[PDB]
């Protein structure tokens, strides 16, 4: 995959036997899903956005493949417009940023 | 350029005749420059993120220079926390996203 930009870049992410779709997000330094059941133990957070900052909850070692691309790492969930994955997952499927 | 996406990708834009940081942000439907003067008339607007929504001022056709590369289109301006260079202009600047 080469993807480019006229259009929003959503992909398909599969994270507990679940079809998502989330926006490839390289200004996003973590990877925010929408509310949802995640296993074991989480911590608080606070990341900010454009709007003010919302608080999530913090998960370690999920795994998530995105795009067939297997990722195993941070996830926060929580009040999200959209599933976002971070640069801490882009970096682990090998994105680039190209122009 | 390649860019890698373990640091944030900032990039140095000329607009309006100064030289700032933003963040090439692939989230990001729109520019959003934080507070500034531009030249020109304005439509109010409010677009959301993670956080809410804020109150921002659209200029059209604007010129700016990202990485060297010009780009015409619309940029807002508003309490953005991050100047934040969107899909808008990406795409003018053949900018794409690839794994
Ligand atoms: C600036 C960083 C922060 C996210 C972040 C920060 C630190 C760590 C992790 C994540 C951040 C990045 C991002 O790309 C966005 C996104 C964003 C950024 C700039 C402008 C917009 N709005 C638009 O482009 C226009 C309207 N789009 C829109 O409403 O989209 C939704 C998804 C809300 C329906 C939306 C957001 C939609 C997800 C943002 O809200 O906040």
Redesign the pocket.
């Given at each position: 995959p080469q993807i480019t930009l006229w259009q929003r870049p959503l992909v398909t992410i599969k994270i507990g036997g679940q079809l998502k779709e989330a926006?490839l997000?390289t200004?996003?330094?973590?990877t925010?899903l929408e509310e949802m059941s995640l296993p074991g133990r989480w911590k608080p957070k606070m990341?900010?956005?454009?709007?003010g900052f919302i608080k999530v909850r913090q998960y370690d070692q999920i795994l998530i493949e995105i795009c067939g691309h297997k990722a195993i790492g941070t996830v926060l969930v929580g009040p999200?417009?959209?599933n976002?994955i971070?640069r801490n997952l882009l970096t682990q499927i090998g994105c680039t940023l190209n122009f």
């Open positions: 926006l997000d200004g996003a330094d973590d925010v990341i900010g956005g454009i709007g999200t417009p959209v976002i971070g």
